[PDB]
Design a protein around this nucleic acid. Structure first.
Length: 49
DNA sequence: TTCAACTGCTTTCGCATCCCAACTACTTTTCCTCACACTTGTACTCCA
């Protein structure tokens, strides 16, 4: 996963997949928001498989 | 041993002259409806 302005290497980390029903967006824990410089207000993140 | 032009670089996704037409004219397409000049007898007397 990476938040797109990739300033440091902790903004591109390896997550484990958890497939959640009934949902239409990617869905992330709060403990990961400091490393991506992320606030949940319309930000997007790319998911490479 | 220096002045002055030629020099590539600021970000990170996604957003975002020729033609046509107007109106009024004039004209052609033809088909239909009759007249205008010519002529022999007959009629009314004509001169024999």
């Amino acid at each position: 996963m990476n938040r797109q302005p990739t300033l440091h290497k902790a903004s591109m980390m390896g997550h484990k997949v958890r497939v959640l029903p009934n949902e239409k967006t990617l869905r992330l824990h709060y403990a990961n928001t400091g490393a991506y410089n992320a606030d949940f207000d319309g930000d997007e993140m790319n998911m490479h498989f």
